[PDB]
Amino acid sequence: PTESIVRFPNITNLCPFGEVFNATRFASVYAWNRKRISNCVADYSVLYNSASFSTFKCYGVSPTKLNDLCFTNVYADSFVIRGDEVRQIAPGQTGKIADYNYKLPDDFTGCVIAWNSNNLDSKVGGNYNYRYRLFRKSNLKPFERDISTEIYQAGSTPCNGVQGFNCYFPLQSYGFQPTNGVGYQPYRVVVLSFELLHAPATVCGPKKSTNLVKNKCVNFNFNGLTGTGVLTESNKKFLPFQQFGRDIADTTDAVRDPQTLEILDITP
Amino acid sequence: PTESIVRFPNITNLCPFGEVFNATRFASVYAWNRKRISNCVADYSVLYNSASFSTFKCYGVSPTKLNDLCFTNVYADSFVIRGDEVRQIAPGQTGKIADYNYKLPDDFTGCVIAWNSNNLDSKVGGNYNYRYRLFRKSNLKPFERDISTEIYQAGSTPCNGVQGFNCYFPLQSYGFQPTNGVGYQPYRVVVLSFELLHAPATVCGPKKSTNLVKNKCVNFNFNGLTGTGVLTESNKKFLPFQQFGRDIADTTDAVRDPQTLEILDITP
Amino acid sequence: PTESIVRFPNITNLCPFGEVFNATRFASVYAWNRKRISNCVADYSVLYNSASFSTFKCYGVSPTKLNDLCFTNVYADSFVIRGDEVRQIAPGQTGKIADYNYKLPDDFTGCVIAWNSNNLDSKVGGNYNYRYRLFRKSNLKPFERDISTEIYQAGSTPCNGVQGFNCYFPLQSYGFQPTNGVGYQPYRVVVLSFELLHAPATVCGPKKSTNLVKNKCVNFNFNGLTGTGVLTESNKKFLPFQQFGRDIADTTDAVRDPQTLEILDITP
Amino acid sequence: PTESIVRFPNITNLCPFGEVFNATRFASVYAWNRKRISNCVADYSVLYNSASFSTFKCYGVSPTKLNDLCFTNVYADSFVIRGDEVRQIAPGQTGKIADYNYKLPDDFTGCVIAWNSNNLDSKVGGNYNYRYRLFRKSNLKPFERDISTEIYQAGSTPCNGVQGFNCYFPLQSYGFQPTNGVGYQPYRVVVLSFELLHAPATVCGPKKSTNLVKNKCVNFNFNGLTGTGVLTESNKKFLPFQQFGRDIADTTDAVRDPQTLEILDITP
Amino acid sequence: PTESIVRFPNITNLCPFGEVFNATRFASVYAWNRKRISNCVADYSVLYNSASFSTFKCYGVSPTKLNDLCFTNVYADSFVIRGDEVRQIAPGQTGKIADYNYKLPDDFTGCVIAWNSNNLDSKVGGNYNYRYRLFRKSNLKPFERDISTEIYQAGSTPCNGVQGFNCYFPLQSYGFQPTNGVGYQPYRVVVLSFELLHAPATVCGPKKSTNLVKNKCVNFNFNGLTGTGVLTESNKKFLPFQQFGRDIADTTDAVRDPQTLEILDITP
Amino acid sequence: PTESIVRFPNITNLCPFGEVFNATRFASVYAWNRKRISNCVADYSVLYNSASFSTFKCYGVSPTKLNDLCFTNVYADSFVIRGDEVRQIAPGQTGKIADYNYKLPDDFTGCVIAWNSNNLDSKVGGNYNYRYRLFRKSNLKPFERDISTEIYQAGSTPCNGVQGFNCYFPLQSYGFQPTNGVGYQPYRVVVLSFELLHAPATVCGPKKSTNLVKNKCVNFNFNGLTGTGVLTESNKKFLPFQQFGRDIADTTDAVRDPQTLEILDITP
Ligand SMILES: *[C@@H]1O[C@H](CO)[C@@H](O)[C@H](O)[C@H]1NC(C)=O
Ligand SMILES: *[C@@H]1O[C@H](CO)[C@@H](O)[C@H](O)[C@H]1NC(C)=O
Ligand SMILES: *[C@@H]1O[C@H](CO)[C@@H](O)[C@H](O)[C@H]1NC(C)=O
Ligand SMILES: *[C@@H]1O[C@H](CO)[C@@H](O)[C@H](O)[C@H]1NC(C)=O
Ligand SMILES: *[C@@H]1O[C@H](CO)[C@@H](O)[C@H](O)[C@H]1NC(C)=O
Ligand SMILES: *[C@@H]1O[C@H](CO)[C@@H](O)[C@H](O)[C@H]1NC(C)=O
Ligand SMILES: *[C@@H]1O[C@H](CO)[C@@H](O)[C@H](O)[C@H]1NC(C)=O
Ligand SMILES: *[C@@H]1O[C@H](CO)[C@@H](O)[C@H](O)[C@H]1NC(C)=O
Ligand SMILES: *[C@@H]1O[C@H](CO)[C@@H](O)[C@H](O)[C@H]1NC(C)=O
Ligand SMILES: *[C@@H]1O[C@H](CO)[C@@H](O)[C@H](O)[C@H]1NC(C)=O
Ligand SMILES: *[C@@H]1O[C@H](CO)[C@@H](O)[C@H](O)[C@H]1NC(C)=O
Ligand SMILES: *[C@@H]1O[C@H](CO)[C@@H](O)[C@H](O)[C@H]1NC(C)=O
């Protein structure tokens, strides 16, 4: 391996992590706000190295390596919970938030970023505008959003839309005050989930593309696909929707150049 | 009485509470900051209607009735403590902040205003820029300020100005973190002391001044002096430092108007 | 005083304290249940000797001297509150229950009897059927019950009968669990308020009457009217509503006998 | 498998769990009560649906599947402890109850049911009738009790069974009050121990016995012996104690019918 | 008033406060040790200037003035209690220590000293050598001890000297741990009660006497009896047991010398 | 296996564990004290018998088997830390002590022995003599000691050798009170480190040295070399640095007798 060749798509616009994180008002956890992120350079070490997030805990990927990876789509799910419920944003965990408000799948790949928000989300006398769903008949499916407001029937009597004995509203207020304990303290949570599935990659890190060298042994990083081999011209006519190539041994022997749209044969 | 005549003097500028309360940085408790406020208009109801002040304790005045009474001079004292010693900013209270950092007289008149500033004065990894005087050979007198950094000799041996065995540095750091408990979270405290000595009033509130009505039994408030009488015209010989006259009964019977310099005979 | 004479009306049915204290379901604190107790004999010893009432606090009446006094009418107010809200059931106290749910007068005469009911009012998973009023525009008057359920306008926008941002339901659930700490455990509260008017006393204790002794110096207890003097047969005519004979000097001169209906002058 | 066939013995007398769980007074933890349950149909639904059991921790068996299985002998160990020491009733923990009062084996197959009993085991002024062994020479063996009252020597002095300096009574009282916290509140604990040997099962659930359908491929459940097969009429001569039968390869190939005492060959 | 003439008796030996306050082992609170301090000089400002004592509350006298007074006798009561029970050592208090172990009179002239002894009295594995009386039929008279060990019958059944159901041992061990809470460390309490009989005082403070100067208007401190006057030779002879000479105004004008034992007359 | 043989070298002197564990004053954790224990007999059972130690965590070796083995060298480390920071003395653990003060290797062979020291290290007025490094530019490598007192720079502003804004002293005083909780409580930690590497072993347990039995099948522990075989004479030419031989199968077949320096042959 004489050289190393990194080829990423030629994109420059930064996708708004600022509008996800530095928003004035977030949403409640029963109505958590999901933003689609695609076609951007994403500097994850801006979020990592900044001393502002108490929890930057990442599942299925390393937080330091996120600049050196490319994902097809990023989902940013922002909401506000209490501190003791910050642990509940994890696969294979139980609680009110995990069962009824926000559920993470067991194959989750992404990061959970939680930081304290006392000055923004508390008020003397109580901040009651952040509600969590307390009552539901069944647990939530992963990434299912439930915003329905129907009176929960906890007994045998029908409720008919009126709260009362054994008939409760499903949404319950946090009631934040700045004098509250650190467990009952407002924490803003943003969950980044990365689609690593077979698709064209849109969100890529700030790594700079190098020029293409052929007919030599080079390490290569084509759109997040890492390998070592000899890149040459290929007579393989790719159909325009195809990015990779593959053989009977299930090995990537052909890739499409992200920039020049050139099909390169990877001879090992 | 028929109507009330409130006479406040011709003052146009506002009292500078803005850099007292909304400053970017506050000083520490050992170097507690003091601002002298005089000769302006102060609207205390803005501070009273705030939804962020957790503690608004007052002494010698009512927390409702502070705006209508108007004062000689306002001493605004600003410092950052943590939440446990907010009770130590009370008169007669004993503690490390009370004995060694900031001591209030037992006859203190004014209001203590404190609010949590965890999003401002705490950083992830620790904020150590706010210090308190842990050691002093004598307890502080009321309202004295000690910023000396001399090494507190706690043993018999002279160690000559270095930290070591029983040779402690007098200041120590709070060490604020955003994940700390509410006792160990930063609280910005602004003591607002007011003196009520025999002097003409310099700070008075946003209450409007009404026109004079003479020769009729009216309730009057002549710039802090409230009475009932038939405010007739005068022929008195008031020297220009004489705010209000007296008599053999030691009762107020002649007041010179603050807005026109006209002496008025009070007759009940 | 040679002898002691006690005359109480010949009433024999017990007061229904068993219906008050041993009811299966107590109402919520916002809808506290008042029962009027009159025309019976009240045995307060069964309340006092039994050891389950953790809080037994009487105001204006000595708690061990409940039996000898006679009362006109008794009001028993029953409800369920959490453990830290028990101290607010007292004259002159403040809190959410005192302001918005149940306010005692500052001149309150009677007892507060609170006992733990964790077995009867908590189920595993949460008992959400006990609600307290959390939002009100103004504090309650003494002995005033508010069961209104209109949406509380916290902000400047009209609520229009729907819960949402800055519009809250005034009632909030306790959510009792048996694993919750004693601050957050159910306590059943019965407040006995005795009124002592100029009306004839109907609620009298279990003290038994003696025979009347006339023309001799005795110490008498005439239906709660204690005193000492020579009871003599009188020619005074009382009208049927009149029960005793206060003179021009406002001292009791004659008493109507509560059993035989006899007019009895008191000499000293 | 066309259908499911379940054959259980026709025992209809219900197992005495009412005497275990609803006894008027339990025993102290040093003298914990053990009851032998056998030869009855057991209903575990009344334990699971009940909303008073705060702890239902089952080791080795699924708590929902207690109703499904059959056992031979059930050991019910009932006692009263305090809340913080409920966590000591589990296989493999330490503490005063685990070491000196009640030890659970590491191979424990059974459930632990703990519920709060503040209404029944606490008295205002203290309930000191519940004792625990505080001092012992060596830690207890599993399922061993020590009701001995011998004065524990904690020094080097033979003090002849008299309490005093370094000679302590082995048993110490709890002293339960309703105002005490949940760490120091009474919890009644019933430990159910199921033993499953190579023995005929006497403790089973209320699952109904269906009619005998032979010569068809059925799922079958013969007295807890689950499987799938084509049950036919046999010619094997089982001895009366011999319940099922095994082939050369130690697989169940014949069973006796629990109801009609008939030998049925299980061919697959 | 030129110069004071302090005359205190020529007492040679210091009071044994060191043996009381510095003893190795203190007695338990049910069997507290009382020591009679008399015929000596006692420095009380040594105790105050030492900062080891957490509590120094003195009732009926000020702690700083104690070196200036001659008391007739001193009683030193030393015991070990819990921290939360330290407040029970006060005149007019309720609790287990006040009712059953150590009762202070309401007319108390003395000082209460309490210092933490987690270092010397606590021990890992438990120090159960300190016991307190938990059960008694009646409350204690002031300065009364109970060393009885009879079984407290709390039911109808007799006990026959055997512990069991409703029969409890009167004394319960404390169980001191070094890992206990702030209310549960051992505290050693010395109660110094100053007997002030109208007698020759024998416990005097450390004040250097001044030789007698007569026939001039001087201050004097004769045996703690402060006064101002002219001291003259006395014509009358007082009885050998009687020192104070009272007048019609109940003021001493004829005092015996506490060094040369001769009568002196005080005149204005 | 007829006769067990234990051959240890003839080492007479006892190890100085008294001067390490029972030292009067320990060093602080930034300047932790390392003592080299070699060429003595060590009794670790008497370390294990004491119940004063609240943590006796041994990593890689079991505490019961400590007397069995032999070591070449022992590293006895000693320091004082608070109770919450005891857990950071562990392999593969993070914290202030682990990063900045004392780091164990990830594969550590030895025992962490920590006991509470409230009685020895606390004093009234606070013991601030114990300091810990709170600020460092880089994390400590394992078994590396840093005693630098250079002022740590946090901001871009140079410190210039004085304490100030964003320039802190790297060492912080603990502040131990006798009234502190168990979290801030002084704990004395000794970390014994053992090397299991093959060398002439100098420190061994108190096991008795048996005689030499030859030409009989015996168990043997030759300086901690456990095995079973028929120990016969050898003609192998062991050099002085060669202590135990090995065969072509890499098994121990010839061991030098530690007492005699005589070469013996293991034969199974
Ligand atoms: C949010 O704003 C702050 C400004 O104080 C900035 O430092 C931070 O980087 C911003 N975060 C994002 C994600 O843009
Ligand atoms: C950018 O990429 C596109 C294809 O995605 C390609 O057609 C174009 O030539 C590239 N431009 C440059 C300057 O590399
Ligand atoms: C403004 O102030 C001056 C002096 O303070 C006073 O004489 C004058 O009357 C005031 N102006 C008005 C319009 O009253
Ligand atoms: C500080 O700034 C906020 C920003 O809205 C303002 O509402 C508040 O009144 C300011 N405080 C003072 C004392 O002016
Ligand atoms: C409630 O019922 C119990 C039954 O055990 C009884 O002891 C108690 O006296 C009753 N309460 C009243 C107020 O009578
Ligand atoms: C009972 O009281 C009534 C009046 O309330 C009276 O008429 C009647 O005589 C009394 N009974 C007796 C036996 O005195
Ligand atoms: C105990 O009694 C209650 C009374 O309703 C009943 O619901 C419960 O099922 C009983 N417990 C058992 C184990 O049968
Ligand atoms: C019930 O079972 C027994 C054996 O357990 C059997 O002898 C008896 O016949 C059965 N009864 C019926 C009605 O089948
Ligand atoms: C000391 O006191 C005695 C009486 O107790 C007295 O007789 C004697 O004179 C005194 N000593 C002096 C030096 O005055
Ligand atoms: C107890 O001993 C210490 C040790 O020197 C001493 O400082 C203290 O003064 C003594 N206390 C008394 C009352 O003598
Ligand atoms: C420390 O001294 C005590 C004194 O009794 C002794 O028991 C203990 O064994 C000593 N510690 C060690 C580690 O030997
Ligand atoms: C002790 O061991 C040495 C070798 O380590 C040996 O030379 C010496 O003779 C031995 N002494 C005794 C008394 O066994």
Side-chain angles (χ1 to χ4, degrees), chain E residues 17 21-22 44 46-56 112-116 187-188 190, chain F residues 124:
Chain E
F17 270 16
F21 280 70
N22 265 343
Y44 303 94
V46 166
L47 298 172
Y48 194 109
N49 296 344
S50 168
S52 306
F53 304 141
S54 82
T55 316
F56 208 73
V112 172
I113 298 94
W115 66 95
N116 202 304
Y187 274 73
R188 304 178 148 197
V190 172
Chain F
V124 298

mmCIF file of all heavy atoms in Angstrom, chain E residues 17 21-22 44 46-56 112-116 187-188 190, chain F residues 124:
data_model
loop_
_atom_site.group_PDB
_atom_site.id
_atom_site.type_symbol
_atom_site.label_atom_id
_atom_site.label_comp_id
_atom_site.label_asym_id
_atom_site.label_seq_id
_atom_site.Cartn_x
_atom_site.Cartn_y
_atom_site.Cartn_z
ATOM 1 N N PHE E 17 -12.052 19.127 86.810
ATOM 2 C CA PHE E 17 -12.840 19.120 85.583
ATOM 3 C C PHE E 17 -12.193 18.260 84.510
ATOM 4 O O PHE E 17 -12.886 17.769 83.611
ATOM 5 C CB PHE E 17 -13.029 20.545 85.068
ATOM 6 C CG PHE E 17 -14.249 21.233 85.608
ATOM 7 C CD1 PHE E 17 -14.910 20.743 86.724
ATOM 8 C CD2 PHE E 17 -14.731 22.378 84.998
ATOM 9 C CE1 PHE E 17 -16.031 21.381 87.218
ATOM 10 C CE2 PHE E 17 -15.850 23.020 85.486
ATOM 11 C CZ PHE E 17 -16.501 22.521 86.598
ATOM 12 N N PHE E 21 -14.261 15.620 82.219
ATOM 13 C CA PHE E 21 -14.392 15.849 80.787
ATOM 14 C C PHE E 21 -13.463 14.986 79.945
ATOM 15 O O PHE E 21 -13.653 14.910 78.727
ATOM 16 C CB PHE E 21 -14.124 17.320 80.451
ATOM 17 C CG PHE E 21 -15.288 18.231 80.709
ATOM 18 C CD1 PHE E 21 -15.700 18.515 82.001
ATOM 19 C CD2 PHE E 21 -15.967 18.813 79.652
ATOM 20 C CE1 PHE E 21 -16.767 19.357 82.233
ATOM 21 C CE2 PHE E 21 -17.036 19.657 79.878
ATOM 22 C CZ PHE E 21 -17.435 19.929 81.170
ATOM 23 N N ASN E 22 -12.472 14.336 80.550
ATOM 24 C CA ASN E 22 -11.471 13.591 79.808
ATOM 25 C C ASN E 22 -11.374 12.135 80.229
ATOM 26 O O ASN E 22 -10.337 11.508 79.985
ATOM 27 C CB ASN E 22 -10.094 14.251 79.970
ATOM 28 C CG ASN E 22 -9.763 15.203 78.840
ATOM 29 O OD1 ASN E 22 -10.387 15.174 77.780
ATOM 30 N ND2 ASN E 22 -8.770 16.056 79.062
ATOM 31 N N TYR E 44 -13.668 28.116 83.847
ATOM 32 C CA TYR E 44 -14.748 27.781 82.930
ATOM 33 C C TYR E 44 -14.524 28.354 81.540
ATOM 34 O O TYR E 44 -15.210 27.951 80.596
ATOM 35 C CB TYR E 44 -16.084 28.274 83.477
ATOM 36 C CG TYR E 44 -16.450 27.751 84.847
ATOM 37 C CD1 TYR E 44 -16.143 28.474 85.991
ATOM 38 C CD2 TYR E 44 -17.116 26.540 84.996
ATOM 39 C CE1 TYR E 44 -16.479 28.007 87.245
ATOM 40 C CE2 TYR E 44 -17.459 26.064 86.249
ATOM 41 C CZ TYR E 44 -17.137 26.803 87.367
ATOM 42 O OH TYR E 44 -17.471 26.339 88.617
ATOM 43 N N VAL E 46 -11.624 27.982 80.017
ATOM 44 C CA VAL E 46 -10.865 26.942 79.328
ATOM 45 C C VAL E 46 -11.800 26.102 78.469
ATOM 46 O O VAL E 46 -11.500 25.784 77.310
ATOM 47 C CB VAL E 46 -10.098 26.083 80.352
ATOM 48 C CG1 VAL E 46 -9.565 24.801 79.726
ATOM 49 C CG2 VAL E 46 -8.964 26.884 80.965
ATOM 50 N N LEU E 47 -12.969 25.767 79.020
ATOM 51 C CA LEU E 47 -13.931 24.920 78.325
ATOM 52 C C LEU E 47 -14.543 25.633 77.124
ATOM 53 O O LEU E 47 -14.769 25.018 76.076
ATOM 54 C CB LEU E 47 -15.019 24.476 79.301
ATOM 55 C CG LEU E 47 -14.520 23.641 80.479
ATOM 56 C CD1 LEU E 47 -15.628 23.420 81.492
ATOM 57 C CD2 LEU E 47 -13.958 22.318 79.998
ATOM 58 N N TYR E 48 -14.820 26.933 77.258
ATOM 59 C CA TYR E 48 -15.455 27.665 76.166
ATOM 60 C C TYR E 48 -14.472 27.904 75.024
ATOM 61 O O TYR E 48 -14.839 27.781 73.850
ATOM 62 C CB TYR E 48 -16.039 28.983 76.698
ATOM 63 C CG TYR E 48 -17.020 29.722 75.782
ATOM 64 C CD1 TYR E 48 -18.371 29.766 76.095
ATOM 65 C CD2 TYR E 48 -16.606 30.355 74.607
ATOM 66 C CE1 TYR E 48 -19.278 30.420 75.280
ATOM 67 C CE2 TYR E 48 -17.504 31.011 73.788
ATOM 68 C CZ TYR E 48 -18.839 31.040 74.129
ATOM 69 O OH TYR E 48 -19.736 31.694 73.316
ATOM 70 N N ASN E 49 -13.222 28.247 75.346
ATOM 71 C CA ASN E 49 -12.254 28.563 74.299
ATOM 72 C C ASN E 49 -11.804 27.313 73.552
ATOM 73 O O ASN E 49 -11.334 27.402 72.413
ATOM 74 C CB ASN E 49 -11.058 29.306 74.893
ATOM 75 C CG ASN E 49 -11.444 30.649 75.477
ATOM 76 O OD1 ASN E 49 -12.521 31.175 75.192
ATOM 77 N ND2 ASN E 49 -10.570 31.207 76.306
ATOM 78 N N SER E 50 -11.930 26.145 74.177
ATOM 79 C CA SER E 50 -11.780 24.898 73.440
ATOM 80 C C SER E 50 -12.963 24.723 72.496
ATOM 81 O O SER E 50 -14.122 24.840 72.906
ATOM 82 C CB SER E 50 -11.683 23.718 74.405
ATOM 83 O OG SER E 50 -11.803 22.488 73.714
ATOM 84 N N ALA E 51 -12.671 24.442 71.229
ATOM 85 C CA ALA E 51 -13.689 24.375 70.192
ATOM 86 C C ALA E 51 -14.155 22.954 69.916
ATOM 87 O O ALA E 51 -14.848 22.723 68.921
ATOM 88 C CB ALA E 51 -13.173 25.014 68.903
ATOM 89 N N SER E 52 -13.780 21.996 70.767
ATOM 90 C CA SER E 52 -14.199 20.614 70.561
ATOM 91 C C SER E 52 -15.679 20.431 70.868
ATOM 92 O O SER E 52 -16.338 19.558 70.290
ATOM 93 C CB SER E 52 -13.354 19.679 71.424
ATOM 94 O OG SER E 52 -11.972 19.890 71.201
ATOM 95 N N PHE E 53 -16.218 21.242 71.776
ATOM 96 C CA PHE E 53 -17.599 21.078 72.214
ATOM 97 C C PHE E 53 -18.551 21.621 71.158
ATOM 98 O O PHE E 53 -18.483 22.800 70.795
ATOM 99 C CB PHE E 53 -17.821 21.788 73.547
ATOM 100 C CG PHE E 53 -16.888 21.346 74.634
ATOM 101 C CD1 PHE E 53 -16.377 22.265 75.531
ATOM 102 C CD2 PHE E 53 -16.528 20.015 74.764
ATOM 103 C CE1 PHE E 53 -15.518 21.867 76.536
ATOM 104 C CE2 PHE E 53 -15.668 19.610 75.767
ATOM 105 C CZ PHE E 53 -15.164 20.537 76.653
ATOM 106 N N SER E 54 -19.437 20.757 70.661
ATOM 107 C CA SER E 54 -20.447 21.202 69.708
ATOM 108 C C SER E 54 -21.509 22.052 70.392
ATOM 109 O O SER E 54 -22.010 23.019 69.807
ATOM 110 C CB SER E 54 -21.087 19.998 69.024
ATOM 111 O OG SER E 54 -22.100 19.440 69.840
ATOM 112 N N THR E 55 -21.865 21.708 71.625
ATOM 113 C CA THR E 55 -22.916 22.390 72.360
ATOM 114 C C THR E 55 -22.365 22.941 73.669
ATOM 115 O O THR E 55 -21.654 22.250 74.402
ATOM 116 C CB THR E 55 -24.088 21.445 72.650
ATOM 117 O OG1 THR E 55 -24.392 20.688 71.473
ATOM 118 C CG2 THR E 55 -25.318 22.227 73.065
ATOM 119 N N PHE E 56 -22.698 24.204 73.951
ATOM 120 C CA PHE E 56 -22.345 24.794 75.237
ATOM 121 C C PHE E 56 -23.502 25.613 75.801
ATOM 122 O O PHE E 56 -23.263 26.686 76.365
ATOM 123 C CB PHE E 56 -21.085 25.671 75.101
ATOM 124 C CG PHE E 56 -20.272 25.786 76.366
ATOM 125 C CD1 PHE E 56 -19.510 24.722 76.811
ATOM 126 C CD2 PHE E 56 -20.240 26.969 77.086
ATOM 127 C CE1 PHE E 56 -18.750 24.830 77.965
ATOM 128 C CE2 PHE E 56 -19.489 27.077 78.242
ATOM 129 C CZ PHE E 56 -18.744 26.006 78.680
ATOM 130 N N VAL E 112 -25.008 22.827 79.714
ATOM 131 C CA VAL E 112 -25.045 21.544 79.023
ATOM 132 C C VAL E 112 -23.904 21.534 78.018
ATOM 133 O O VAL E 112 -23.813 22.420 77.162
ATOM 134 C CB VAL E 112 -26.397 21.315 78.336
ATOM 135 C CG1 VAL E 112 -26.345 20.077 77.463
ATOM 136 C CG2 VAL E 112 -27.494 21.190 79.371
ATOM 137 N N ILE E 113 -23.028 20.535 78.103
ATOM 138 C CA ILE E 113 -21.879 20.412 77.219
ATOM 139 C C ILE E 113 -22.024 19.101 76.467
ATOM 140 O O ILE E 113 -22.229 18.054 77.084
ATOM 141 C CB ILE E 113 -20.549 20.446 77.995
ATOM 142 C CG1 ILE E 113 -20.350 21.775 78.728
ATOM 143 C CG2 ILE E 113 -19.377 20.192 77.069
ATOM 144 C CD1 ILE E 113 -20.802 21.806 80.176
ATOM 145 N N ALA E 114 -21.933 19.154 75.144
ATOM 146 C CA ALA E 114 -22.048 17.946 74.342
ATOM 147 C C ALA E 114 -21.016 17.983 73.231
ATOM 148 O O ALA E 114 -21.001 18.921 72.430
ATOM 149 C CB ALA E 114 -23.454 17.805 73.752
ATOM 150 N N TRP E 115 -20.157 16.970 73.181
ATOM 151 C CA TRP E 115 -19.174 16.883 72.112
ATOM 152 C C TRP E 115 -19.248 15.524 71.437
ATOM 153 O O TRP E 115 -19.589 14.514 72.061
ATOM 154 C CB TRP E 115 -17.743 17.141 72.604
ATOM 155 C CG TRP E 115 -17.189 16.127 73.546
ATOM 156 C CD1 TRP E 115 -16.406 15.059 73.227
ATOM 157 C CD2 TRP E 115 -17.318 16.116 74.969
ATOM 158 N NE1 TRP E 115 -16.064 14.366 74.359
ATOM 159 C CE2 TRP E 115 -16.611 14.997 75.444
ATOM 160 C CE3 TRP E 115 -17.977 16.935 75.887
ATOM 161 C CZ2 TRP E 115 -16.541 14.677 76.795
ATOM 162 C CZ3 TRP E 115 -17.907 16.616 77.227
ATOM 163 C CH2 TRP E 115 -17.195 15.498 77.669
ATOM 164 N N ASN E 116 -18.927 15.518 70.145
ATOM 165 C CA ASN E 116 -18.950 14.297 69.355
ATOM 166 C C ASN E 116 -17.827 13.362 69.782
ATOM 167 O O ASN E 116 -16.676 13.774 69.940
ATOM 168 C CB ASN E 116 -18.814 14.629 67.869
ATOM 169 C CG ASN E 116 -19.339 13.527 66.969
ATOM 170 O OD1 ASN E 116 -18.911 12.378 67.054
ATOM 171 N ND2 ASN E 116 -20.266 13.879 66.089
ATOM 172 N N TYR E 187 -22.471 11.005 71.294
ATOM 173 C CA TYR E 187 -22.187 12.325 71.830
ATOM 174 C C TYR E 187 -22.061 12.200 73.333
ATOM 175 O O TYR E 187 -22.959 11.666 73.991
ATOM 176 C CB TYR E 187 -23.283 13.328 71.476
ATOM 177 C CG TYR E 187 -23.100 13.994 70.138
ATOM 178 C CD1 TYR E 187 -23.329 13.297 68.962
ATOM 179 C CD2 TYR E 187 -22.700 15.319 70.050
ATOM 180 C CE1 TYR E 187 -23.166 13.901 67.734
ATOM 181 C CE2 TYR E 187 -22.535 15.933 68.825
ATOM 182 C CZ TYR E 187 -22.771 15.217 67.671
ATOM 183 O OH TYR E 187 -22.606 15.817 66.447
ATOM 184 N N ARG E 188 -20.952 12.682 73.869
ATOM 185 C CA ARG E 188 -20.751 12.715 75.306
ATOM 186 C C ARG E 188 -21.266 14.036 75.848
ATOM 187 O O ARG E 188 -20.916 15.109 75.345
ATOM 188 C CB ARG E 188 -19.281 12.523 75.663
ATOM 189 C CG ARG E 188 -18.690 11.261 75.088
ATOM 190 C CD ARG E 188 -17.221 11.114 75.427
ATOM 191 N NE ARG E 188 -16.842 9.715 75.573
ATOM 192 C CZ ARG E 188 -15.731 9.298 76.162
ATOM 193 N NH1 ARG E 188 -14.858 10.150 76.672
ATOM 194 N NH2 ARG E 188 -15.490 7.993 76.242
ATOM 195 N N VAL E 190 -21.883 16.326 79.318
ATOM 196 C CA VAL E 190 -21.626 16.670 80.706
ATOM 197 C C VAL E 190 -22.553 17.819 81.065
ATOM 198 O O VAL E 190 -22.501 18.886 80.441
ATOM 199 C CB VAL E 190 -20.161 17.055 80.940
ATOM 200 C CG1 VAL E 190 -19.980 17.594 82.343
ATOM 201 C CG2 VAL E 190 -19.261 15.864 80.693
ATOM 202 N N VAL F 124 -11.642 18.458 64.572
ATOM 203 C CA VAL F 124 -12.560 19.589 64.567
ATOM 204 C C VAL F 124 -11.876 20.788 63.923
ATOM 205 O O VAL F 124 -10.648 20.940 63.992
ATOM 206 C CB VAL F 124 -13.054 19.894 65.990
ATOM 207 C CG1 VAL F 124 -13.814 18.700 66.540
ATOM 208 C CG2 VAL F 124 -11.896 20.236 66.912
#
